[PDB]
Amino acid sequence: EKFLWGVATSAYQIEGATQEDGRGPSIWDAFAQRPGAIRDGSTGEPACDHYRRYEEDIALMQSLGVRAYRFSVAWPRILPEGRGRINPKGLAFYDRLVDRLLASGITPFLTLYHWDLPLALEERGGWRSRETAFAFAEYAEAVARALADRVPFFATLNEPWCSAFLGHWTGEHAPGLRNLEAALRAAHHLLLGHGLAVEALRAAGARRVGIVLNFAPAYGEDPEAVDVADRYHNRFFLDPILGKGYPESPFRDPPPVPILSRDLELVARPLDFLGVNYYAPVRVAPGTGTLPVRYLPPEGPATAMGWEVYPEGLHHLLKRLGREVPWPLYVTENGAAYPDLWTGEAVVEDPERVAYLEAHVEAALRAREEGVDLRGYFVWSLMDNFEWAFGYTRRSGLYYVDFPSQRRIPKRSALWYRERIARA
Ligand SMILES: [Cl-]
Numbered sequence: 001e002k003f004l005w006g007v008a009t010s011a012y013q014i015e016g017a018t019q020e021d022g023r024g025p026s027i028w029d030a031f032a033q034r035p036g037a038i039r040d041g042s043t044g045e046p047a048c049d050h051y052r053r054y055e056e057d058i059a060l061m062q063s064l065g066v067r068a069y070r071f072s073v074a075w076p077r078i079l080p081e082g083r084g085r086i087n088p089k090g091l092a093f094y095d096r097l098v099d100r101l102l103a104s105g106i107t108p109f110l111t112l113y114h115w116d117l118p119l120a121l122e123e124r125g126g127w128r129s130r131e132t133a134f135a136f137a138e139y140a141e142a143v144a145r146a147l148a149d150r151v152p153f154f155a156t157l158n159e160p161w162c163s164a165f166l167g168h169w170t171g172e173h174a175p176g177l178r179n180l181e182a183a184l185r186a187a188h189h190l191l192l193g194h195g196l197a198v199e200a201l202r203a204a205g206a207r208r209v210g211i212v213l214n215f216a217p218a219y220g221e222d223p224e225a226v227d228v229a230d231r232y233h234n235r236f237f238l239d240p241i242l243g244k245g246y247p248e249s250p251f252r253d254p255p256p257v258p259i260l261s262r263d264l265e266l267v268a269r270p271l272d273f274l275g276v277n278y279y280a281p282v283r284v285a286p287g288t289g290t291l292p293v294r295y296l297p298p299e300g301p302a303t304a305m306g307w308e309v310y311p312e313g314l315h316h317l318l319k320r321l322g323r324e325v326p327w328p329l330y331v332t333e334n335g336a337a338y339p340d341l342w343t344g345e346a347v348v349e350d351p352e353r354v355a356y357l358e359a360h361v362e363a364a365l366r367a368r369e370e371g372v373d374l375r376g377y378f379v380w381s382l383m384d385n386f387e388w389a390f391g392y393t394r395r396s397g398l399y400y401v402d403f404p405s406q407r408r409i410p411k412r413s414a415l416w417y418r419e420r421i422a423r424a
Pocket of ligand 1: 160162212214
């Protein structure tokens, strides 16, 4: 089988067209309207204008020799109120995107939920409400019904840890809640929606179904604080998915999780793959409160995000997961933000991104050459885009995007990756 060399994006981060063609607003449209939620005061509009420029963007993928494209479908384009009414212009756009990928030799790799919950559902309680899980499954169904003839890979959710905890506890992500019980309700309904979606997907013909999780491996001098960090970030969604139930709580005095009877059996549905998102480890020490850990400074070289560059961390992570996960792994995101500047040249010099990607590729391939069933590697991202709370200030792309003209300019890392893929 062909190992999948890919690149990854998400709908709200690149599309624009936020109020075109019947698109309903999402929780990110509203969150971005709040003063100080986005550091540069920016919004999803108009991201990279990908909704009009997707031909051009696929041609960029072709010119790197990439063989797979990981993207998300915007739920609010498909069902503008989240449930019930279906907007055919929505499915028409993704239908045409899929045809073009196939005509260009590219394997579609589809994410159903990448954070853009329809605002209509959030105003009925969003992921805190059990009904949102059933709305998710109905959405998943309508997508596979239209797309599964040509899209081999569907992932239900992208990083539900961010959606639960950054979305409902630290309030850093949309909606923007700060309540641990709202977060645990959200974690449980994201998982319940995952399981219900799996059944809808298969019933509608999806061939490979999985999920994409974020791993931030924890290191430090005290094993106990390491284990608390690992339970909170690395096992809280994986263990349920694996059918081991939730891990022992990392929280002091947690509130109840609205686990209903049979929910855990629904959540632990057989999958065809696990998507691994990795960027950095975290160094921890013993800390005090609700979550009794303290997060320490990066040891040595760090990206613009202040995230430690530690390629060995990906290798170790893949070995550990290789023993524990009974499905093949895909690294569905890996990449780095550095402050790229462009002043007219035909290429944007990003030697730190080149260094970052080369070392991480060598790590992942090493895990595979030691017998991890690793079947693909995707760079976040194809191009510079809207980076959530960071707006346009953190550039992660293989292509530089000059946002005023939408011109795409290749960086050194694009040329590095093209040659990388070729040397297969
Ligand atoms: Cl996650």
